[PDB]
């Protein structure tokens, strides 16, 4: 079964070239009600839905090791984004779909990974990014990678304006190859949904 | 537990020897155990 | 009277790896709970088995490629955790801290060519005993080997067997050993069809019976 | 074994595929708690010193393995060679407290002092990397095991007890230029 | 022979908080009885919960007062055991000897106006995350808050909740932290009727789950 | 009792280690336990 | 209080043969299996009983020979583990490391002549008590002795008995003892027929009750 | 086992005191026990 439909709230995504879903580090969330929020946290399901971001253009000239990253959360102009401005503390996991649409006559390979506590990796460390939750996108096989990760961090709730626990990373493993019948470049997009969104500590209004 | 090999108990109580954990799981062991082995397809051995 | 004891010469000095514990001084500390924190690993080899990491070929590429459709040796490397090709792998990163190992090492080959590119490859394990590795698939056929072609499944995995005189082998390599003590792995392309710019990505992981023993602290500090 | 590489599902083939037999393995030496449980040097010292495991050497056995994890937890043992009395204060204490006897203070007894200390951070686990700031690169100041002070601190060894590691990160061997193998002098009998 | 022992290096030194006892030298002393002596306390927090002590506002007054009947911020203070306003309280006197705390802190408000003076007040807990505390009841309404008016019962008590990223917070405050790490408490007067010279006395006590841990000896001696 | 954590007994008898109390009570614990909580009046939650 | 102990003078020094064990420092080492490795020996005397080794006669020959067919003393040697004739034997090689012994020592005689050569021999044990060993079979006949002739079975074995005043004898020989303390063994040829160039090979092994006691390290080092 | 004579156990566990043998026999004892004794032939004692 290569055809998968994912639903997050009133948004869905259907892909006919998937290689399944990779769960990173766990298949469930730690407890969302601990001592640090004194039972004042609440869940906001209206934020649990897909938002979109263009990551980069995969062109033939990008060599092995070329890396593009997106720290999460990112700027969000919807419900999730308003939560970041209205509550002091939050926690959520991520449901991540990355697509790279060219055609089956393209060759090459991208590594898609979710990295906790991002730090710039040296060139030698790039050979080991598969230690992190990941999938590959290779035109001969799939156009979509799908990874699901839980919230984590030294603190049970976080202040996202000060710390970003997860970073989506896309790295060229083998360069994009082109033919007379292939696409000439592939635009890479992310379709991301925050999961199990909890907030605590309502803030005053700015005016 | 770890690199210790005294056959005899510790002279001190555990509440002193270590911090005590409270409650409110080996992911990589599960991941490795779940690996596929063998082949795929049809064998002619 | 009281108990007479012999304070014994040669005992009592601090040894950095001793199996005893220190006397405590600050009691009753309760920790914040960390029940079910994700991503825990309790043995380095669980991680090494589950997460293959990339080999390093000429020019720092995790793959081999060939432009000719003729049969050719694409790569040859020492079966050594200290091999140049293994130097950026997690398996070698762990192995440097142990003096010895035994067991299976698994190689993974992932073809990344377009749908219209096809190839047939061969991997052979060449034990110690010959001066130089075989340069053709025909000479290497007499060794333990596997051949496979590309298709719907892009990945092929092969176990490099532990075959040696002693039960364990050294993880490091000595300045005196010229040809590798554990042999070589040779990767050949039997032939290909329209696969000139297409690559074969290679990675390595620990096998089921891979084992490391005798912890050491060898790096310059 | 043949599979879909893109899915990234773990696959562990064995020698049985071509007629061999998988052997027994004994992995006690790569057990996490066991391997981290030994003393290592801290090295950059001052008479007032905040205990931070990230000050272990990055290529040392313990320092490298610690950096190969994102989060960790452990209790601690320390061996300190010092002049004067040694005082320790927990995570969060004002530096000024190091001057007072009411805090755990060890009176000098040659050749050095060995103590067992509990984890005292306010977080459920600590991290070796932290992607963000802690003020209203570096690690938050709260990532420590307390601080010690003596007239002079000559040497400091730390030992992680009942260690737990989470979320593996890259661990590198020395880079090789030889084009074949990194070679070095392995111990061998004289004459 | 006798028992051989290893006198171990690194052990045996005196540690001021050690968990062992000294050898005795003067036995059989019987004490005068002190059965049921009154006023015993066995835990500092029982006292801290039961006996609220006064906050300190501008000019060393344990109360706030306002002469205008308009809505106004009567006081704002850091949720910190090291806050100026808490500096003469028993809770802060105890907290200085511990490095960390978590749990509820209770504020008590007692109106002392005459029978013909009435007022309506509001208290809000403002978490960290904004540059400055809200100056009006309207902006603060979006925070956790309580409003109450004066009447037969002169006292109102409100729990300041523990809401933070970590499970414990530091009792002391560092020179580097500019705005308070735990937020603020803001007390407003919504309005009043003929209450110009009348005051609201404020005191603080430990809540049911308030906890202090990790004893320290920090004062200059 | 207090800050002591030896798992093993004391080598000396209690009549020597400490003074012995004779006979002829936690007030603040009672006081704190007796505190009112909740509200007062009528709730509309 | 804690346990009072008397650190005792005169105890605790290292003794090279002490019966205690050192403190360990590197645990959990599992060894390669060595199940049923062949050729194991657990007691030196099992080897000494089962494997006779050669005596040494004039000119370093493990045999005696005679050209005359008359009766003659072929060899005489001291019953001593330090005897010249025993100096290249395994039994003496082991015995030098013990101060005392008791029990039976077995001598083996193997005739190597051709089929047409015949002889009759005699071996006698001469205890201490006479100035010089008997030079003829007739004088030696009054001692414990055995006579045998050559035939199909080429080997004859004879037990030298332990007969002494004390229960143990010294393995070494002192500079002061002129004639041997334990006596002599004399080997005679009674007569022979056409055996002029034929030899009698002599070897020695430990008997069933041979015993060595009190380990010593005597060689110059 | 060997030259050791403590009546009391070892303070440390065996996994620390010694290496541990694994499995997948006294030849000279058998050889010596098997030796012929007595005579051979016919005795006239």
């Amino acid at each position: 079964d290569r055809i998968l439909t994912t639903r997050n709230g009133h948004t869905t995504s259907t892909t006919q070239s998937s290689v399944g879903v990779t769960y990173g580090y766990s298949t469930q969330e730690d407890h969302v009600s601990g001592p640090n929020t004194s039972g004042l946290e609440t869940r906001v399901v209206q934020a649990e839905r897909f938002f979109k971001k263009h990551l980069f253009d995969w062109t033939p000239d990008k060599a092995f090791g070329h890396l593009e990253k997106l720290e999460l959360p990112t700027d969000h102009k919807g419900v999730y984004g308003h939560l970041v401005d209205s509550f002091a503390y939050m926690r959520n996991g991520w449901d991540v779909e990355v697509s790279a649409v060219g055609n089956q006559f393209n060759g090459g390979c991208l590594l898609v990974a979710m990295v906790p506590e991002w730090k710039e990796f040296t060139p030698r460390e790039k050979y080991q990014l598969t230690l992190f939750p990941h999938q590959f996108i290779s035109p001969r096989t799939n156009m979509t990678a799908h990874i699901v990760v839980p919230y984590l961090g030294v603190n049970r709730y976080d202040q996202y304006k000060k710390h970003k626990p997860w970073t989506l990373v896309v790295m060229v493993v083998s360069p994009l190859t082109t033919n007379t019948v292939s696409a000439g470049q592939i635009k890479v997009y992310a379709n991301i949904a925050p999961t199990h969104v909890h907030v605590a500590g309502e803030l005053p209004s700015k005016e | 537990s770890g690199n210790t090999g005294s056959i005899i108990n510790n002279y001190y109580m555990q509440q002193y020897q270590n911090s005590m954990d409270t409650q409110l799981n080996d992911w990589f062991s599960k991941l490795a155990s779940s690996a596929f082995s063998g082949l795929f397809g049809a064998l002619l051995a | 009277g009281i108990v007479p004891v012999a304070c014994s010469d040669g005992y009592g000095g601090l040894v950095t790896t001793d199996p005893k514990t220190a006397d405590p001084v600050y009691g009753m500390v309760y920790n914040p709970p960390r029940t079910n924190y994700p991503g825990r690993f309790t043995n380095l080899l669980d991680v090494a088995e589950a997460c293959p990491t990339f080999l390093c070929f000429d020019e720092g590429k995790p793959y081999v490629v060939t432009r000719t459709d003729e049969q050719r040796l694409l790569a040859k490397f020492d079966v050594s955790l200290a091999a140049k090709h293994m130097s950026n792998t997690y398996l070698s990163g762990i192995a440097q801290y142990y003096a010895q190992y035994s067991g299976t090492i698994n190689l993974h080959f992932m073809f990344t060519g377009s749908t219209d590119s096809k190839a047939r490859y061969m991997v052979a394990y060449v034990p110690p005993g010959v001066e130089t590795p075989p340069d053709t698939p025909e000479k290497a056929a007499h060794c333990i080997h596997a051949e496979w072609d590309t298709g719907l499944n892009s990945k092929f995995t092969f176990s490099i067997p532990y075959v040696s005189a002693a039960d364990y082998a050294y993880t490091a390599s000595d300045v005196a050993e010229t040809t590798n003590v554990q042999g070589w792995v040779c990767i050949y392309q039997i032939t290909h069809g329209k696969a000139e710019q297409d690559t074969l990505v290679v990675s390595v992981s620990a096998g089921k019976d891979f084992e490391l023993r005798l912890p050491i602290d060898p790096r310059s500090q | 074994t043949t599979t879909t590489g893109e899915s990234a599902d773990p696959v562990t083939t064995t020698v049985e595929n071509y007629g061999g037999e998988t052997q027994v393995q004994r992995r006690q030496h790569t057990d996490v708690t066991f391997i981290m449980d030994r003393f290592v040097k801290i090295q950059n010292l001052n008479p007032t010193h905040v205990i931070d495991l990230m000050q272990t050497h990055q290529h040392g056995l313990v320092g490298a393995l610690l950096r190969a994890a994102t989060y960790y937890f452990s209790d601690l043992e320390i061996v300190v060679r010092h002049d004067g009395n040694l005082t320790w204060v927990p995570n969060g204490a004002p530096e000024a407290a190091l001057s007072n006897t009411g805090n755990p203070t060890a009176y000098l007894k040659a050749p050095f002092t060995r103590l067992a200390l509990p984890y005292t951070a306010p977080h459920r686990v600590l991290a070796t990397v932290y992607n963000g700031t802690s003020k209203y690169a570096q690690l938050p100041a709260s990532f420590n095991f307390g601080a010690i002070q003596a007239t002079t601190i000559h040497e400091l060894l730390v030992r992680m007890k009942r260690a737990e590691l989470y979320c593996p990160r890259p661990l590198l061997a020395v880079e090789v230029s030889s084009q074949d193998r990194h070679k070095q002098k392995i111990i061998a009998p004289a004459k």
Side-chain angles (χ1 to χ4, degrees), chain A, chain B, chain C, chain D:
Chain A
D1 194 39
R2 302 290 308 292
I3 172 165
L4 171 66
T5 289
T6 297
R7 217 253 282 178
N8 283 295
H10 301 145
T11 66
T12 65
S13 185
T14 298
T15 175
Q16 300 188 63
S17 61
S18 92
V19 292
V21 176
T22 288
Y23 287 87
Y25 303 142
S26 184
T27 49
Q28 39 117 58
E29 305 263 348
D30 46 31
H31 196 326
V32 307
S33 307
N36 70 304
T37 54
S38 303
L40 294 166
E41 71 287 343
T42 59
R43 176 156 182 198
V44 185
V45 302
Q46 294 78 11
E48 301 175 358
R49 62 201 319 292
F50 283 119
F51 66 90
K52 284 118 163 75
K53 282 278 311 192
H54 171 255
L55 300 176
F56 75 114
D57 295 332
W58 186 17
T59 54
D61 59 292
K62 298 186 165 73
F64 161 67
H66 179 87
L67 188 154
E68 213 67 62
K69 68 167 186 60
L70 176 69
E71 304 185 28
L72 301 169
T74 190
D75 217 313
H76 189 290
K77 313 290 182 180
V79 173
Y80 180 89
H82 187 253
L83 299 181
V84 179
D85 286 324
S86 311
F87 292 86
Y89 300 103
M90 293 180 66
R91 61 173 279 144
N92 66 88
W94 302 104
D95 183 6
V96 182
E97 246 199 352
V98 169
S99 75
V101 180
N103 70 17
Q104 62 274 50
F105 294 92
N106 282 110
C109 177
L110 292 177
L111 171 68
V112 179
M114 285 295 285
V115 179
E117 313 300 341
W118 165 262
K119 165 216 81 98
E120 264 283 313
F121 293 105
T122 72
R124 290 187 71 211
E125 295 174 317
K126 289 174 177 179
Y127 288 76
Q128 294 182 36
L129 293 191
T130 48
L131 286 173
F132 300 107
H134 69 282
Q135 281 195 339
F136 294 96
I137 292 177
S138 181
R140 61 183 291 95
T141 300
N142 60 320
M143 298 192 290
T144 293
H146 197 153
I147 305 168
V148 175
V149 297
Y151 170 82
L152 40 57
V154 305
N155 294 323
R156 200 175 329 276
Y157 277 64
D158 211 346
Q159 302 178 76
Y160 294 141
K161 283 171 171 181
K162 292 169 61 196
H163 172 255
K164 286 179 172 19
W166 285 106
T167 296
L168 166 60
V169 169
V170 179
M171 183 181 83
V172 171
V173 171
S174 194
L176 180 68
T177 60
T178 63
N179 285 330
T180 44
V181 301
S182 79
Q185 59 163 32
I186 296 180
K187 302 189 95 79
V188 184
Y189 288 81
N191 192 29
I192 302 164
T195 62
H196 305 291
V197 178
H198 291 75
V199 299
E202 43 268 57
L203 295 175
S205 60
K206 313 196 174 180
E207 319 167 309
Chain B
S1 165
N3 177 25
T4 43
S6 310
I7 256 171
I8 318 303
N9 260 294
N10 172 24
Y11 182 85
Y12 297 96
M13 298 169 331
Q14 173 174 51
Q15 314 82 264
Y16 278 80
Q17 192 66 50
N18 299 93
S19 57
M20 343 234 49
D21 301 329
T22 63
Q23 297 314 314
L24 248 196
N25 200 232
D26 191 335
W27 178 252
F28 283 92
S29 195
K30 290 159 190 160
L31 203 56
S33 296
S34 84
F36 306 111
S37 294
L39 322 162
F40 193 124
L43 171 73
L44 182 60
Chain C
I2 64 189
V3 184
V5 301
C7 322
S8 306
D9 282 352
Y11 296 75
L14 162 75
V15 180
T16 54
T17 54
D18 75 5
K20 51 176 150 56
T21 55
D23 284 348
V25 300
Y26 201 68
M28 327 262 42
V29 174
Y30 289 84
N31 303 313
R34 61 189 186 277
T35 312
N36 300 330
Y37 192 85
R40 182 159 185 204
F41 58 105
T42 59
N43 195 290
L44 304 175
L45 293 187
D46 291 331
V47 179
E49 268 181 43
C51 308
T53 60
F54 304 126
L55 262 66
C56 186
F57 299 98
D58 55 282
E59 303 184 81
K61 298 305 174 189
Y63 55 77
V64 293
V65 46
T66 185
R67 317 204 60 181
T68 182
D69 69 341
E70 295 191 306
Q71 73 179 202
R72 292 249 197 294
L73 171 64
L74 297 176
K76 163 279 176 192
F77 59 88
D78 297 343
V79 174
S80 166
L81 290 150
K84 191 232 81 169
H85 308 67
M86 300 273 288
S87 71
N88 297 334
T89 68
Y90 179 73
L91 191 63
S92 291
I94 283 168
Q96 72 190 311
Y97 295 112
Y98 294 89
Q100 296 171 25
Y101 83 94
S102 56
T104 312
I105 292 168
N106 288 340
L107 287 179
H108 306 247
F109 305 91
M110 189 170 72
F111 184 65
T112 67
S114 48
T115 272
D116 62 300
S117 64
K118 306 279 182 75
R120 194 161 178 89
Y121 300 104
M122 172 183 158
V123 59
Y125 167 58
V126 185
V130 282
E131 255 182 291
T132 58
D135 56 324
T136 66
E138 291 79 3
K139 301 189 207 180
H142 306 295
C143 296
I144 288 166
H145 77 261
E147 203 179 281
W148 75 100
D149 61 15
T150 60
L152 237 58
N153 288 175
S154 62
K155 190 198 243 192
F156 180 71
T157 311
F158 171 80
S159 295
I160 296 167
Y162 180 83
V163 182
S164 191
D167 283 5
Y168 286 93
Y170 292 159
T171 53
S173 189
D174 185 84
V175 290
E177 52 183 279
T178 46
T179 52
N180 190 56
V181 163
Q182 246 50 247
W184 306 284
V185 168
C186 292
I187 301 164
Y188 305 86
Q189 158 174 284
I190 297 306
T191 187
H192 71 51
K194 211 58 169 56
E196 305 84 26
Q197 51 181 182
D198 294 303
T199 75
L200 186 65
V201 175
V202 190
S203 58
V204 68
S205 62
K208 269 179 63 180
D209 56 2
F210 184 79
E211 172 188 328
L212 288 167
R213 69 171 197 149
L214 314 173
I216 50 167
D217 183 17
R219 305 286 295 275
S220 186
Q221 297 163 59
Chain D
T1 316
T2 294
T3 53
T4 302
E6 300 84 351
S7 72
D9 288 329
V11 45
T12 296
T13 189
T14 66
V15 297
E16 273 78 2
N17 285 8
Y18 49 86
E21 179 169 337
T22 292
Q23 307 296 303
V24 163
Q25 88 292 344
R26 294 158 215 281
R27 296 181 173 175
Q28 304 69 28
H29 288 351
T30 49
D31 171 82
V32 168
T33 299
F34 174 82
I35 194 61
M36 307 301 275
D37 194 358
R38 60 202 63 242
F39 284 105
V40 291
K41 281 211 171 194
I42 281 306
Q43 226 132 57
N44 279 327
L45 310 172
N46 306 281
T48 294
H49 185 89
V50 175
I51 303 168
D52 169 11
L53 298 186
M54 288 307 288
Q55 280 169 310
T56 46
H57 189 295
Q58 65 185 312
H59 297 316
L61 171 52
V62 172
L65 291 182
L66 179 64
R67 288 168 176 81
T70 305
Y71 306 104
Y72 65 96
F73 165 88
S74 79
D75 276 331
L76 205 71
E77 278 191 21
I78 61 176
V79 170
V80 191
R81 187 147 62 70
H82 55 94
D83 290 336
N85 298 328
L86 179 76
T87 294
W88 170 84
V89 294
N91 181 305
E95 187 172 296
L98 286 162
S99 309
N100 307 310
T101 289
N103 302 292
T105 296
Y107 277 60
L108 186 45
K109 183 199 215 301
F112 41 61
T113 304
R114 179 179 177 168
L115 306 171
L117 297 170
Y119 178 90
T120 58
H123 314 284
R124 54 192 181 166
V125 295
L126 294 183
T128 58
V129 191
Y130 185 78
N131 184 40
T133 327
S134 210
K135 305 192 57 187
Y136 277 134
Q138 292 159 63
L139 294 179
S142 58
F143 290 11
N144 66 66
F145 280 79
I148 52 176
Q149 183 178 93
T151 300
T152 305
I153 294 182
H154 305 290
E155 187 173 1
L156 169 63
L157 307 184
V158 297
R159 179 166 181 172
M160 297 182 71
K161 305 297 305 185
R162 63 192 202 87
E164 299 172 2
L165 300 182
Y166 305 82
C167 308
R169 305 187 73 86
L171 175 60
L172 293 164
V174 301
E175 50 175 346
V176 181
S177 43
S178 265
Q179 201 56 64
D180 65 326
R181 257 175 293 152
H182 170 52
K183 302 203 258 296
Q184 55 190 322
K185 197 203 182 314
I186 293 185
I187 60 162
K191 298 160 196 170

